[PDB]
């Protein structure tokens, strides 16, 4: 509870050290942001005083060091891949996934059994049109299926944690050299692990893990 | 290593508070005792700087109330006994203590087999004779066997982490009322638990347990 965060707080900030002169610089950039509110959004915020906000600044600010290098060359060269645009039908029931395989190999339209039968509202209107993404969009199992499509080439169904797809690649982008991307595969992995919740807590769990600790969510 | 330290006086200090104004007050009692050496001591104890000798008063204090908040009404009146006066013979064999009981019970002098037997340093040249002690002053093995046995008589093997003991009571003190004794027997309790690494680093496993946390020795 309170016990918990104190000291999975003071794990991270001990390994990931943040200067007193970065941590007062993040404050004093929220005390002119809200200027004489200060107290009643960090009282709506939950926050015992201005002591217990800059402990949460110091860890906000250990944690964004410890995801900037949770980011090895081997993983921006595991994202070194062209962007590709696939459609997909997302069905929860693996045998309605292969008989939607089945009519597509007859020549059914993808693009109406998309409208009709896929469960990802983001896409099911675009005939399951997801557009151009990158490597790191999609979840590991769609992206490792997709990527070994020819162009026009559906797959057969694919399992991953929203059940299961059909994929059908339909366009792949040039490839710049390495040296010429690298530093933007680098700061995309460092952005989606940031804004990412499921990431940040997954590296707490392993960082109190590193350090011989059970402790329980 | 460092980072088990930090958790484990972040749990005590966190749970048992003491005010910054008693830990400068203890930190000062220091300074004033070695003077322009307090560097040099502070330096010889292994002590980063000033910074870290205070978390580690901080921490003693906090253990200490930690320490004497352990001790309960009802351990006061566990240890509400009269003080008594005991000979032993320790062996580390028990059938060598059965041998040793034998003898006593043909009339064999206790003073001389002790003298001779028992791998107690501390009484053997005593002919055995530990005096007068009160109860917590022994193992609870042997403190349970002694306080069982009338004025003379001999205990069976009486097995303790220190090995196998004939035991024989010799006095036994008349007992005041306990409201005139508990202040005293709470002191006593309070100093040999403080005064015990054994006692207060077992406290310490317990409250991590309390708190849910799993950590190596």
Redesign the interface.
């Known amino acids: 509870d309170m016990?918990y965060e104190?000291?999975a707080q003071?794990?991270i900030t001990?390994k990931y050290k943040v200067s007193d002169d970065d941590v007062d610089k993040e404050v004093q950039k929220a005390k002119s942001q809200y200027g004489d509110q200060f107290k009643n959004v960090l009282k709506n915020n939950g926050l015992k005083d201005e002591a217990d906000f800059k402990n949460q600044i110091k860890f906000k600010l250990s944690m964004n060091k410890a995801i900037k290098q949770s980011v090895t060359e081997k993983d921006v060269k595991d994202h070194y891949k062209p962007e590709i645009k696939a459609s997909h039908i997302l069905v929860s029931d693996e045998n309605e996934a292969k008989e939607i395989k089945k009519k597509l190999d007859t020549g059914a339209s993808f693009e109406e059994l998309a409208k009709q039968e896929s469960q990802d509202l983001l896409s099911k209107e675009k005939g399951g049109d997801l557009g151009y993404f990158h490597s790191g969009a999609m979840t590991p199992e769609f992206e490792t299926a997709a990527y070994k499509l020819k162009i026009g080439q559906i797959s057969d169904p694919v399992q991953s944690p929203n059940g299961y797809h059909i994929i059908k690649l339909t366009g792949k982008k040039d490839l710049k050299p390495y040296d010429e991307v690298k530093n933007s595969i680098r700061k995309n992995l460092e952005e989606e692990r940031t804004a990412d919740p499921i990431f940040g807590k997954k590296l707490l769990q392993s960082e109190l893990k590193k350090?011989?600790?059970?402790?329980?969510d």
Do not use: E, G, P, T
């Not at 350090?211 to 329980?216: G, V």
């Open positions: 016990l104190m000291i003071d794990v001990k350090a011989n600790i059970k402790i329980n």
